[PDB]
Amino acid sequence: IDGMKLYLQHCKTCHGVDGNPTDLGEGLGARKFADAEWQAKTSDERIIEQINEGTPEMMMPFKEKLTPEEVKALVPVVRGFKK
Ligand code: HEC
Numbered sequence: 358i359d360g361m362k363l364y365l366q367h368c369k370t371c372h373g374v375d376g377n378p379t380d381l382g383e384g385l386g387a388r389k390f391a392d393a394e395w396q397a398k399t400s401d402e403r404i405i406e407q408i409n410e411g412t413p414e415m416m417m418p419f420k421e422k423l424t425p426e427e428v429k430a431l432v433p434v435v436r437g438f439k440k
Pocket residue numbers: 364367368369370371372381382385386387388399403404407408411412415416417419431435
């Protein structure tokens with residue numbers, strides 16, 4: 358399973374190639390991933406829950422689109438943006 362390939366296919370349109378949100382993502386409410394303070398207060402389970410369930414009117418749920426293994430493979434991608 359390629360995490361980065363999944364991210365570019367499903368996430369980059371809102372969150373950006375570097376974790377800095379696009380025009381679409383920012384307008385919907387997304388903040389940058391390369392944020393030390395965000396990374397520090399955010400658990401892996403919070404990242405997994407967000408991918409799975411989304412946020413109403415902000416981010417679609419991905420639980421019917423990706424297996425738990427695919428969701429888990431995205432954690433290091435999100436973590437790898439920092440600074
Ligand atoms: C545009 C429709 C989006 C797509 C496609 C994806 N995400 Fe997203 N995400 C979006 C918004 C507007 C927000 C803010 C809403 C909120 O409740 O925080 C988010 C949030 C995240 C978060 C952070 C949650 C937190 O606790 O701070 C993560 C980790 C995240 N999103 C990851 C993510 C991944 C891995 C995606 C592809 C499968 C993805 N998102 C798609 C907008 C959009």
